[PDB]
Amino acid sequence: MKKENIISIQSQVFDGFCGNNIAAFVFRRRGHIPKILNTVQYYSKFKHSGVELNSQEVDIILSEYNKDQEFMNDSNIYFLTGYIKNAECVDMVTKNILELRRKRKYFIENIINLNFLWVCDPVMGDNGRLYVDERVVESYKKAIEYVDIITPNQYETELLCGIKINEEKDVIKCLDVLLHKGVKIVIITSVNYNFDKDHLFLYVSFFNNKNKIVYFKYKILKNCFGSGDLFSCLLLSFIVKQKGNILHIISKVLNIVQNVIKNSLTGLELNIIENQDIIASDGLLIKEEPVF
Amino acid sequence: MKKENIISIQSQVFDGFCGNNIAAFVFRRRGHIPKILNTVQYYSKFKHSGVELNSQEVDIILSEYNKDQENDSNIYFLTGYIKNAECVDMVTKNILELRRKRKIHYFIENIINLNFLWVCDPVMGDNGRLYVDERVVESYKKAIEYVDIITPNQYETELLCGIKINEEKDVIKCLDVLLHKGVKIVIITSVNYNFDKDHLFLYVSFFNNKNKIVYFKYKILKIHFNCFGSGDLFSCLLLSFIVKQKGNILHIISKVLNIVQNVIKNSLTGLELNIIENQDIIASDDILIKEEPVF
Numbered sequence A: 001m002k003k004e005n006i007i008s009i010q011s012q013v014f015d016g017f018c019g020n021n022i023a024a025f026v027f028r029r030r031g032h033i034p035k036i037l038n039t040v041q042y043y044s045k046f047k048h049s050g051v052e053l054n055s056q057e058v059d060i061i062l063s064e065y066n067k068d069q070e071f072m073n074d075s076n077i078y079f080l081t082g083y084i085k086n087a088e089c090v091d092m093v094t095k096n097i098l099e100l101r102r103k104r105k106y107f108i109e110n111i112i113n114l115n116f117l118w119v120c121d122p123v124m125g126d127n128g129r130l131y132v133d134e135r136v137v138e139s140y141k142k143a144i145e146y147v148d149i150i151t152p153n154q155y156e157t158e159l160l161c162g163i164k165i166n167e168e169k170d171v172i173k174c175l176d177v178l179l180h181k182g183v184k185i186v187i188i189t190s191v192n193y194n195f196d197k198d199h200l201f202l203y204v205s206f207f208n209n210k211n212k213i214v215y216f217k218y219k220i221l222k223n224c225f226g227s228g229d230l231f232s233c234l235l236l237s238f239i240v241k242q243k244g245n246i247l248h249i250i251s252k253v254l255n256i257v258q259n260v261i262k263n264s265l266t267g268l269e270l271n272i273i274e275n276q277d278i279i280a281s282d283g284l285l286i287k288e289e290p291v292f
Numbered sequence B: 001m002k003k004e005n006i007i008s009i010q011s012q013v014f015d016g017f018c019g020n021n022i023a024a025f026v027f028r029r030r031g032h033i034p035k036i037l038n039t040v041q042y043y044s045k046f047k048h049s050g051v052e053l054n055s056q057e058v059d060i061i062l063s064e065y066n067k068d069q070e071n072d073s074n075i076y077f078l079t080g081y082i083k084n085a086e087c088v089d090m091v092t093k094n095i096l097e098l099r100r101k102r103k104i105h106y107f108i109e110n111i112i113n114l115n116f117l118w119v120c121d122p123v124m125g126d127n128g129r130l131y132v133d134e135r136v137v138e139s140y141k142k143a144i145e146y147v148d149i150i151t152p153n154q155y156e157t158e159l160l161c162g163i164k165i166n167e168e169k170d171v172i173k174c175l176d177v178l179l180h181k182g183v184k185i186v187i188i189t190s191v192n193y194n195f196d197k198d199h200l201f202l203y204v205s206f207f208n209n210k211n212k213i214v215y216f217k218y219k220i221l222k223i224h225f226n227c228f229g230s231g232d233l234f235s236c237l238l239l240s241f242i243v244k245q246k247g248n249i250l251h252i253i254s255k256v257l258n259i260v261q262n263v264i265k266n267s268l269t270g271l272e273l274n275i276i277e278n279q280d281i282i283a284s285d286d287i288l289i290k291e292e293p294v295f
């Protein structure tokens, strides 16, 4: 039984739930022992007072991890990246993940390689507001080539694709550009259409075991931030442990997010702690809808 | 019922369990929602590669927190690993500002003030050696009078009091000193006597509801393992039981200790405590270690 290594490289906040405040606890609560790298430490998602890791500090932590991993070819390495605020750090994270892969080189374990995965949540913005540089945007575009699974929201997809999304045809072309860049699975977590405001759509795409590409929509009804962060870390925990069919995994993840969402209306944050037994669950639905 | 605020000011590591990697999860898994300020981000307890907040960056976080409370909520500080003396003073200054801004100053409710606690775990060293900036020892001595509950190991007790502990009478002098400097509850988490090599002793002291000092000890069979952080586990569990469970503090200390011993017993394998695998016992509310008086 190869040894599980999950490395989660994201934001941390003094007050609230986002980046690694969600992911570190969801992982641990589900039986995992994640390595944690905090890219920033902010007062809260709203007051970005605090401290950022510069690229050299990222490289010092990550290089030490590559030192322990060299010659130690007995483990499955799983990177989950989210909020990185400057493109040098994004470049440095990418180089370090890349240098690890070079040393150690619809079921999810034949779409991608469970010995080594990079799951990139490309936290750049939402709904017209942008948290990073146009430099960070081009850094992810250079990194997509090396990413196993990318989980942008709709806005972030527009940024990496250079394509505004107004109807489903734009989504398909968007899924297409990211896939031909080398990403193995695209999930666009939420796309909202002008003509259906009560609902939002999650799309997922990938080549099948016959070199043919496949699309699926998930229709969900509607906000508190951090749903995307919950979604991503929940996705890796299902993939690496349960394994099996990705489209089943996604429904199961959606089952948990919705059920936590249902309790975080009385506030502004998600109720990560009040619903921790839900977060630790099986995911028991919204069934895939194929797209052409 | 008032809003609970727990603020854990400790270290963070990339790999392994110490400081806030323990306390955040312990707190969260027990249904609290700690605020979290990582004082350092190191690769591991043994590889202090990484970044350390300076005292201005500590003051940025905590002063923003003080602004949002200048109310109707109980405030519980837990401080642990802090490498830098000026960062220790800035934590002290800010905790005191919060005390100043609200005119602040065996059932635990009658021993301490559950409106506002500073539980100071003054991490400085162990087994004869020191692991902090050396001026940090002076900075924790400045803080003693301001601290409600202080939980040093033996060596840190010796540092704060200026005397070496070789016999029980030395433990009592140390408990007497720290209590008379104004701490409400002193807990020396382990003492190793050159004459009882198979056991560890934990001591607790305080003034009871009659303004008489009492001293209790817990005799722990020394399990011979290779992992640290049980002190961090001890202190966050202590706070959690104090603010949720309340009641008899000596009971609270027996329960914490049992949980700690059980985690250690399922962590004889490796070099880190097996927090995750033993998270369920950690979540709990088998008593092998029990208090005895010392007089």
Ligand SMILES: Nc1ncnc2c1ncn2[C@@H]1O[C@H](COP(=O)(O)OP(=O)(O)NP(=O)(O)O)[C@@H](O)[C@H]1O
Pocket: A121, A122, A123, A124, A125, A126, A152, A153, A154, A156, A188, A189, A190, A200, A202, A220, A221, A222, A223, A225, A226, A227, A228, A229, A231, A254, A257, A258, A261
């Ligand atoms: N109003 C809503 N009601 C219920 N579920 C929702 C709602 N909005 C989002 N979700 C769920 O939350 C998931 C995350 O969607 P999304 O809004 O793209 O995350 P995000 O936070 O914007 N991405 P990021 O912050 O960059 O990591 C979706 O896949 C839905 O399952």
Ligand SMILES: Nc1ncnc2c1ncn2[C@@H]1O[C@H](COP(=O)(O)OP(=O)(O)NP(=O)(O)O)[C@@H](O)[C@H]1O
Pocket: B126, B152, B153, B154, B188, B189, B190, B200, B202, B220, B221, B222, B223, B224, B225, B227, B228, B229, B230, B231, B232, B234, B257, B260, B261, B264
């Ligand atoms: N070898 C051991 N056998 C049994 N219990 C132990 C052992 N070491 C520690 N403990 C328990 O853990 C508690 C905390 O240990 P202690 O060594 O006093 O904390 P610390 O030294 O500040 N932190 P650490 O770095 O983990 O040693 C003690 O009070 C005991 O309950």
Ligand SMILES: Cc1ncc(CO)c(C=O)c1O
Pocket: A011, A012, A013, A018, A019, A042, A044, A045, A046, A083, A123, A225, A226, A227, A228, A229
């Ligand atoms: C600090 C920080 N980290 C992560 C996210 C993504 O939810 C956000 C924005 O929602 C954020 O502000």
Ligand SMILES: Cc1ncc(CO)c(C=O)c1O
Pocket: B011, B012, B013, B018, B019, B042, B044, B045, B046, B081, B123, B131, B228, B229, B231, B232
């Ligand atoms: C960073 C850090 N945090 C906590 C501790 C002790 O639990 C140590 C001691 O080894 C440490 O180095």
Ligand SMILES: [Mg+2]
Pocket: A024, A025, A028, B024, B025, B028
């Ligand atoms: Mg946690």
Ligand SMILES: [Mg+2]
Pocket: A121, A151, A152, A153, A188, A189, A190, A228
């Ligand atoms: Mg997303």
Ligand SMILES: [Mg+2]
Pocket: B121, B122, B123, B151, B152, B153, B231, B232, B235
């Ligand atoms: Mg301690």
